[PDB]
Design a protein around this ligand. Structure first.
Ligand SMILES: COc1cccc2c(=O)[nH]c(-c3ccc(C)cc3)nc12
Ligand SMILES: [Zn+2]
Lengths: 47, 162
């Protein structure tokens, strides 16, 4: 696993071309996330 | 150890998580290649994940980060899709769960778009899709995503051409 940028604890990846795309985030220590909910689902075929 | 507690669909907590899933679906530039073709989900179950040890590991680090960032943890709720979901809920996140080739570095990746995380349920690029049908757009087989508490602290902003 890489290290965070110096002085930082994560990276925010922000799409600059697709205006409807939301951000993606990267952490470099597993201790900075807790798996709070487990969601079971199917994708639905569009009608 | 981890225990999983089912939420009732009549519970506001269930309904809030479902709405976060459904409202953050978007179209993807691969036309559905990795995650499938869909505009919405059928939510089958939502479980709360309870592990005292993992929670304490998380809150200890959150406190360290908050103090380094002038009393601001910058904590978010974000999606995570992974072929290692079964391992993560029991053992917690660690380096085995990182995306080594990710475009923002070798680290563990989370999304605001549920549909972005859905692209990783069957592996990077959707792998070969579901085990039973080898279909990245399978409408039959059940999938799992995590909705996670994530401490960002001071976050480096990287614009990306995506
Ligand atoms: C660019 O990678 C991602 C962006 C946003 C969300 C995720 C995400 O939810 N999971 C993974 C991912 C990638 C590789 C492996 C092995 C596991 C998860 N990558 C993501
Ligand atoms: Zn299938």
């Amino acid at each position: 696993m890489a290290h965070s940028p110096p002085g930082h604890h994560s990276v925010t990846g922000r799409p600059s071309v697709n205006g409807l795309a939301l951000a993606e985030y990267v952490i470099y220590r597993g201790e900075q996330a807790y798996p709070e909910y487990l969601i079971t689902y199917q994708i639905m075929r569009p009608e | 150890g981890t225990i999983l507690i089912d939420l009732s669909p009549d519970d506001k907590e269930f309904q809030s998580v479902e709405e976060e899933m459904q409202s953050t679906v978007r179209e993807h530039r691969d036309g559905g290649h990795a995650g499938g073709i869909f505009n919405r989900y059928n939510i089958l179950k939502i479980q709360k994940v309870c592990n005292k040890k993992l929670w304490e590991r998380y809150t200890h680090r959150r406190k360290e980060v908050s103090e380094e960032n002038h009393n601001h943890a910058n904590e978010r709720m974000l999606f995570h899709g992974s072929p290692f979901v079964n391992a993560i809920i029991h053992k917690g996140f660690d380096e085995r769960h990182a995306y080594i080739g990710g475009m923002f570095g070798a680290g563990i990746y989370f999304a605001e778009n549920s549909s972005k995380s859905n692209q990783y349920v069957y592996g990077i690029g959707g792998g070969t899709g579901c085990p039973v049908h080898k279909d990245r757009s399978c409408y039959i087989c059940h999938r799992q995503l995590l909705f996670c508490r994530v401490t960002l602290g001071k976050s480096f902003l990287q614009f990306s051409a995506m």
